[PDB]
Structure formats: C-alpha cells, structure tokens
Amino acid sequence: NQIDLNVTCRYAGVFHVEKNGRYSISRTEAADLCQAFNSTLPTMDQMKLALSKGFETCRYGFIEGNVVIPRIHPNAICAANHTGVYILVTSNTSHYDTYCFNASAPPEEDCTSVTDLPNSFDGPVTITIVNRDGTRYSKKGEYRTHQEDI
Numbered sequence: 001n002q003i004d005l006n007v008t009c010r011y012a013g014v015f016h017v018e019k020n021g022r023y024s025i026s027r028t029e030a031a032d033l034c035q036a037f038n039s040t041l042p043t044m045d046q047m048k049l050a051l052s053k054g055f056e057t058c059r060y061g062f063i064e065g066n067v068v069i070p071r072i073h074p075n076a077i078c079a080a081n082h083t084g085v086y087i088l089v090t091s092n093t094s095h096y097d098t099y100c101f102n103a104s105a106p107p108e109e110d111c112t113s114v115t116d117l118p119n120s121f122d123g124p125v126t127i128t129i130v131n132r133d134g135t136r137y138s139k140k141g142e143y144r145t146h147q148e149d150i
C-alpha cells in the first residue's frame with residue numbers, strides 16, 4: 001500500500017505534485033492532497049505570481065477552478081508552444097496532477113527539498129515524498145477523505 005508524490009521547487013509558495021508518476025489525481029483528491037501539505041489549490045493570481053518568479057512545468061494540474069500548465073519558455077511539446085498560465089479548455093478526462101500553494105513558503109524561488117507531510121492523517125499507506133534531486137521522505141498515513149478516490 002504505497003503512494004509516491006513527486007514534488008517541485010516552490011515559487012511564491014506554489015508547487016507541482018504528481019502522484020505515482022502518472023496523471024492520476026481527481027479534483028477531490030487534489031484538494032485533499034494539498035491539505036496534507038498544509039496547502040490549498042492555488043488561485044489563478046497566485047499561479048501567475050509563481051510563474052513570474054520562475055515557475056514552469058510540462059504537466060497539466062489543478063488549480064482552483066481550472067486545469068493549467070505554467071509556461072515560461074515556448075516548447076512545442078508543452079502546452080502547444082504557449083507561454084503564460086496555459087488553461088486546458090477541452091478534455092474528455094478528469095484526472096491530472098495538482099498544484100498546491102503554501103502561504104508559509106518563501107516569497108520567491110525555493111528549491112530546497114520537501115522533507116515533511118505535516119498534515120497527513122493516521123492511515124495504512126506508505127506515502128513517499130520524492131524530490132527532483134531524489135531525496136525522499138516517507139511516512140505511514142492517509143490524506144484522502146473521499147471514498148471514490150480510495
């Protein structure tokens with residue numbers, strides 16, 4: 001019973017989380033996952049500020065209200081070469097990665113590793129935070145509050 005959470009640097013508190021190396025998070029699970037990081041889904045304004053501080057990914061993820069990809073540099077295989085906060089308009093499907101916003105993070109780029117999942121609850125799952133530099137932090141717990149996600 002294992003979940004891996006790959007996390008990015010934070011930019012103005014905003015970061016990206018990918019579950020188990022594939023698009024696999026529902027909107028309800030996304031909210032719960034951010035809550036486990038003492039975080040919330042970012043607003044569009046929070047995401048725009050993060051983008052301005054250097055945040056970009058090549059992955060769709062939830063924010064409050066939309067599914068987006070922040071892009072700084074045009075790349076043909078990331079958000080169809082767009083820059084800015086690219087908003088997904090048309091999709092059949094419901095599972096993506098997520099973004100999260102931590103108000104207590106530093107104001108600009110924080111590329112230190114994440115070494116805690118401070119608001120996980122008691123549970124049976126081995127949850128492993130995986131940083132981009134490979135450093136890991138694991139704990140037994142749960143974060144999902146909706147049965148249809150479990």
Ligand SMILES: Nc1cccc2c1CN(CCCOC1CCOCC1)CC2
Nearest residue numbers: 006007008018058059077130131132133
């Ligand atoms: N942040 C982090 C921490 C630990 C592991 C990983 C990450 C970030 N993942 C980046 C995934 C990028 O995939 C792109 C999307 C499709 O085009 C190829 C690149 C790759 C795996």
